[PDB]
Amino acid sequence: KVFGRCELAAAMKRHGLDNYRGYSLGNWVCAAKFESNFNTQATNRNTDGSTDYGILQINSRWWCNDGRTPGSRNLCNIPCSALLSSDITASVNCAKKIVSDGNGMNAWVAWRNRCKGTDVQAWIRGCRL
Ligand SMILES: [Cl-]
Ligand SMILES: [Cl-]
Ligand SMILES: [Cl-]
Ligand SMILES: [Cl-]
Ligand SMILES: [Cl-]
Ligand SMILES: [Cl-]
Ligand SMILES: [Cl-]
Ligand code: NA
């Protein structure tokens, strides 16, 4: 499922992303654009062996089982495929967790590089929310 900035923002809002960790709803939508491009079946194979899943490219070293990332964990207790689902309750429910973890949204690299310290609110400019 390919989301639309608005639809995603609102999607994120009802799922407790709105201001979670004090990261305003905009942030996630920006985080989204560049991790996945508002996209759910988005994946990545990083040559370390792990794979990134979901609208937020959640990496299978720490956060999801996928069965093929020798020596990893599954904090968030799900198969990485849950993250590809159109119902994002997971990408969120784990996203919540990752962000809660310690580094703040920095875990998301693209957010670090492409969203940090910028016009964020713009990513919801004039959405109906
Ligand atoms: Cl967009
Ligand atoms: Cl914002
Ligand atoms: Cl594994
Ligand atoms: Cl594999
Ligand atoms: Cl554990
Ligand atoms: Cl699992
Ligand atoms: Cl933080
Ligand atoms: Na795993």
UniProtKB/Swiss-Prot annotation:
What the entry lists under PANTHER family is as follows: LYSOZYME C
Q: Which family does it belong to?
A: Belongs to the glycosyl hydrolase 22 family.
- PROSITE patterns according to UniProt: GLYCOSYL_HYDROL_F22_1, GLYCOSYL_HYDROL_F22_2
Q: What class of enzyme is it?
A: hydrolase
Q: What else is known?
A: Lysozyme C is capable of both hydrolysis and transglycosylation; it also shows a slight esterase activity. It acts rapidly on both peptide-substituted and unsubstituted peptidoglycan, and slowly on chitin oligosaccharides.
Which residue pairs form cystines in this protein?
Answer: C6-C127, C30-C115, C64-C80, C76-C94
Q: In which tissues is it expressed?
A: In the egg white and polymorphonuclear leukocytes.
Question: Which residues does the record give as substrate binding sites?
Answer: D101
Location in the cell:
Secreted
What gene name is listed for this protein? LYZ
Functional summary from the UniProt entry: Lysozymes have primarily a bacteriolytic function; those in tissues and body fluids are associated with the monocyte-macrophage system and enhance the activity of immunoagents. Has bacteriolytic activity against M.luteus.
Q: How does it assemble?
A: Monomer.
The chemistry this enzyme catalyses reads:
Hydrolysis of (1->4)-beta-linkages between N-acetylmuramic acid and N-acetyl-D-glucosamine residues in a peptidoglycan and between N-acetyl-D-glucosamine residues in chitodextrins
* All residue ranges annotated as the C-type lysozyme domain in the record: 1-129
Q: What keyword terms does UniProt attach to this protein? A: Allergen, Antimicrobial, Bacteriolytic enzyme, Disulfide bond, Glycosidase, Hydrolase, Secreted, Signal
List the molecular function annotations (GO) for this entry: beta-N-acetylglucosaminidase activity; identical protein binding; lysozyme activity
Kindly list the GO CC terms recorded for this protein: cytoplasm; endoplasmic reticulum; extracellular space
One GO BP on record is: defense response to bacterium
**Which species does this protein come from?**
Gallus gallus (Chicken)
EC number(s) on record? 3.2.1.17
Q: Which residues form the active site?
A: E35, D52
Superkingdom is Eukaryota
Name of the protein this chain belongs to: Lysozyme C
